[model samples]
Target: IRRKLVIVGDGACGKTCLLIVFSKGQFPEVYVPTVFENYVADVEVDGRRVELALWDTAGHEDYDRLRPLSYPDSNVVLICFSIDLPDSLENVQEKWIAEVLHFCQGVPIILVGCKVDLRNDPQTIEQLRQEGQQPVTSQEGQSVADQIGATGYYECSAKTGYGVREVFEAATRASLMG
Candidate 1:
């Protein structure tokens, strides 16, 4: 059987890139901040074949009116945040989570910390420190997940393939059992 998975987060916060890597194997050379399209992944979870329809959404305010169109019939929602952008995670609670809960009431939500690879990057850290913010820590992410009643929490770097596959697998598990 097939199921739906939608990815949402703040604009330019690495949500699209994560979906691209999950479906395309390699990240795109050019970074385009938009919702490219949808892709399907044939994944085996708990001895059954699952065709996950991966839907992408632009996180900018411009799409706020159209975003909910993709939420109907969704089985899972991946609410993403760029680890390097602390405010992105904050928005997860302030906006994304609240929005998803309204439209996708019973769907399982997996909070993803995107751009995990940037968390330790010197330039990324220094830039955020200038603004009195820092990369989101694992504990912080988990706490946010708990606060929002997320089914699970994960961190991944699509740029390096770190935790990318693991998160998808976790998504499969959450979809079926969460």
Candidate 2:
């Protein structure tokens, strides 16, 4: 089976890295920013083979008009946030969800927390603390998923290769159902 997956969130929230880690199995050392890109990920789950057409979109407002073009046939939409950037999670509700809902009615939604490695990083925590903030917790991500009625909630670190497979597995399963 073939499916399309569109990932959207604020710029630099690790969306590109997440896709790279899943599709290529290596963390980008140079970190070139994404504008719009496509990748094909072939995965097998439960004895069924699935090909995912991955759409990496520019999250900055500069390409807001172009971003929606990728949403039209999305089989599963992952609305992502960086665990270190709490406002990106805030934008999940304030911005991304609204856009996804408008363009992808009946499409299954998955809320993803990116850069989970930073959630416990000493430097990251210290920086947030200095600003009177804290890294977003797993509970906070799950709560937002519930609030947004997402089909599932997941968090992963591309650098560490944690929880990345399960996210795509779930997306593949959701794609079958929806």
Candidate 3:
């Protein structure tokens, strides 16, 4: 069966970066907000060829009220956050995850931490951990994954193309199983 997946997150949290990396297999440093909607190539999973349609929404507060409409018909929801910002992680749950669960219902949710390469400093990682914060790395991403009932967790760097393929592949495979 074909599945539609929607990616939502705060502005500059790398939503577009994730999309571009998965779709084109190339990372761009910058991306303008999608005007309406965009479609990427279909992914093959479990003997099924399913197209992945990515819907990028405006991150403005006023635009969030319309998120339900944006999420309709989706089979998977990928909520993204940046590793550098703790608030982005909270926003993923408080805003995107909550809204998707309330509206989309039963769709698989995946929590993704983007910009992993940006947090390679040992000091930065330790500081966040000491502050009781989760970094945008594999371990913390897995923690968030468990907390949110995500099918899986991913730590990706769109700029350097790390873990990008795995994230989309996992999401697509989970959608098939669901």
Candidate 4:
């Protein structure tokens, strides 16, 4: 059997980065937002073929209503967020998280914190702290992972190829179990 995995997240939140890393096994230093849905990769696992389809939905509010159509056939939903942006996390609830859970109940969901490389910047870390925001460190990712019943939370740097494989591996495993 074939399984379909869908990745969704706000613009500039590393959705494309994750897709590139997973598909090409490399990350680009700079990324452009996906105009429509991008098909990232196809891999085999457990005697089954799986296709990873990443949908980088436009962040504009006007595009919000189109998600249901995009997400209907997904076997797994990957919610990507950037560790550098608190508003990205905050917007998850209002954007697609709730609707995904409501419309695609029982589907395995993975919460990913992209751009782990950025977390090493002292200035950015301090700025985020000063703003009374939670840094997108492994610990913070774990908290979100736990809260959302995610199989796991991963901190990955698509730019640096850090922890990229493990994220999708976990997501694939979770999809199999679900």
After superposition, the stretches of candidate 3 with alpha carbons farther than 4 Å from their true spots are 121-136
Off by over 4 Å in 2: 129-131, 176-178
TM-score of 3: 0.75
Q: How much lDDT does each candidate structure score?
A: 0.71, 0.72, 0.66, 0.63
Tens-digit lDDT track of model 4 for 143-166: 866876765665655566676555
> Model 3 Cα RMSD, Å?
3.4
* Candidate 2 C-alpha lDDT tens digits along 52-118: 7888876878987777887865656666666766666677689888877787765666767777767
Model 2 pairs whose backbones collide = none
Cα error, candidate 4, residue 27 (Å): 4.9
TM-scores for the candidates? 0.84, 0.86, 0.75, 0.76
lDDT per residue, candidate 3, 1-178, as tens digits?
4456666665666667766767777666786565346566666656666566777675657665655566765665666565766767777767776676676665666666666777666676676678676556577768777987776676655567676556666777776565
**Segments in model 1 whose C-alpha atoms lie over 4 Å from true places:** none
Candidate 3 weakest lDDT stretch, 10 residues: 31-40
Q: Residue 1 of candidate 3: its Cα lDDT?
A: 41
The better candidate by lDDT, 1 or 3, is: 1
